[PDB]
Amino acid sequence: GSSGSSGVCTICQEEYSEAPNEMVICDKCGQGYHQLCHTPHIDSSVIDSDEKWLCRQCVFATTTKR
Ligand SMILES: [Zn+2]
Ligand SMILES: [Zn+2]
C-alpha cells in the first residue's frame, strides 16, 4: 500500500515544530533536530536563511588533520 517517507526528530522523535524550538533537517543524513534538542542548540540565523544546515556529527567532521 501507499508509503511515503519519515521526517521526525532524532532526540525526542517529535514532528511538532514551533520556534524558538524549531526543527532543522540535515542535508547529509536527512534527519531532523530541534533547536532545543541539537547540541549545541542550533541558531535561528541558520533557519531564517535558506542555507543548508548539517548536524553536529557531520559538522564536527568539517576539519580533519589527516
Ligand atoms: Zn526533538
Ligand atoms: Zn548529518
Side-chain angles (χ1 to χ4, degrees):
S2 61
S3 193
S5 284
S6 286
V8 206
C9 197
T10 305
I11 302 83
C12 62
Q13 280 292 342
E14 279 284 36
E15 281 180 55
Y16 89 70
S17 64
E18 170 73 333
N21 197 11
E22 270 166 324
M23 182 193 273
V24 181
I25 302 297
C26 177
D27 198 299
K28 185 150 155 65
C29 318
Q31 298 279 32
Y33 301 72
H34 292 125
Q35 294 190 267
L36 286 181
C37 289
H38 190 278
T39 310
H41 310 139
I42 301 164
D43 188 34
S44 64
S45 288
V46 178
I47 301 170
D48 205 33
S49 210
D50 40 56
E51 278 169 32
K52 71 90 173 60
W53 169 95
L54 283 162
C55 68
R56 171 150 152 158
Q57 298 287 45
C58 291
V59 177
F60 194 94
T62 176
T63 301
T64 186
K65 200 175 90 270
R66 279 158 163 201

